[PDB]
């Protein structure tokens, strides 16, 4: 996240950290995700696309740091890894970029509620906040586009939703952004999501609930002028989600 504050998981108790094992001994961070229900985490298909071997990914809930433990965290294996059929990538956009991970712990249970583990709410069929709403994104991604390491402490920031009209202006992204995508930027292009933030949540409030409005998907550069971050529009995938949960 460029800009932002450092936070602890108590402020995003539904945030999930997905790592990949290299039996060589190391585990690396892959992307972020969100807990929908006790056993399901949602993230972005492009995070798994190149190496869809579920057996090698680990998911942690209640983690405030990237490579050090947090007390209260839970670790799970991925029981099911559902990527979206019709996912596509072009010179910038990722289409149908949402993924579901069914988790199971070594004891055979799913997430349990605590002060560091909570689920986030889903929106209702094609129900979104209006552009202008300020939402928050969270994650362990880069702090500057030139960095080559990720922060060790979780970060969070606030970004505002912009309209498609604004985001599809030719000097922004043109028709690369569809109606199954959402754009969010900072008025002063000072904070944004970035490499390593893929899969995490864009939470806005809808009807009185903190709702998972978008999934960090792509962006040209990070905190660049006229280059909003693009998120998958969860409200447009509700049936897809239902058909698998």
């Amino acid at each position: 996240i460029i800009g932002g504050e450092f936070t602890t998981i108590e402020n995003q108790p539904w945030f999930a950290a997905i790592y990949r094992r290299h039996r060589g001994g190391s585990v690396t961070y892959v992307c972020g995700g969100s807990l929908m229900s006790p056993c399901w985490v949602i993230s972005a298909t492009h995070c798994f696309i190149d190496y869809p071997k579920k057996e090698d990914y680990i998911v942690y809930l209640g983690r405030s740091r990237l490579n050090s433990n947090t007390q209260g965290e839970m670790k799970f294996e991925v029981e099911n890894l559902i990527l979206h059929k019709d996912y596509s990538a072009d010179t910038l956009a990722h289409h149908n970029d949402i993924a579901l991970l069914k988790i199971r712990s070594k004891e055979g249970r799913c997430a349990q509620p605590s002060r560091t583990i909570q689920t986030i709410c889903l929106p209702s069929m094609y129900n979104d906040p209006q552009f202008g709403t300020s939402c928050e994104i969270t994650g362990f991604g880069k702090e500057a586009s030139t960095d080559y390491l990720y922060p060790e402490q979780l970060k969070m920031t606030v970004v505002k939703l912009i309209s498609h009209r604004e985001c599809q202006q030719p000097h922004y992204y043109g028709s690369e952004v569809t109606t199954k995508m959402l754009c969010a930027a900072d008025p002063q292009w000072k904070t944004d999501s970035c490499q390593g933030d893929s899969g995490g949540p864009l939470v806005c409030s809808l009807q009185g609930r903190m709702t998972l409005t978008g999934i960090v998907s792509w962006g040209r550069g990070c905190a660049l002028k006229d280059k909003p971050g693009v998120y998958t529009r969860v409200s447009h995938f509700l049936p897809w989600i239902r058909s698998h949960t």
């Binding site: 108590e10 108790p13 509620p113 002060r115 909570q118 709410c121 609930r209 903190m210």
Partner: peptide, 9 residues
């Protein structure tokens, strides 16, 4: 005990 989506505190 049980989840309440969206509730932090």
């Amino acid at each position: 005990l049980k989840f309440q989506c969206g509730q932090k505190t």
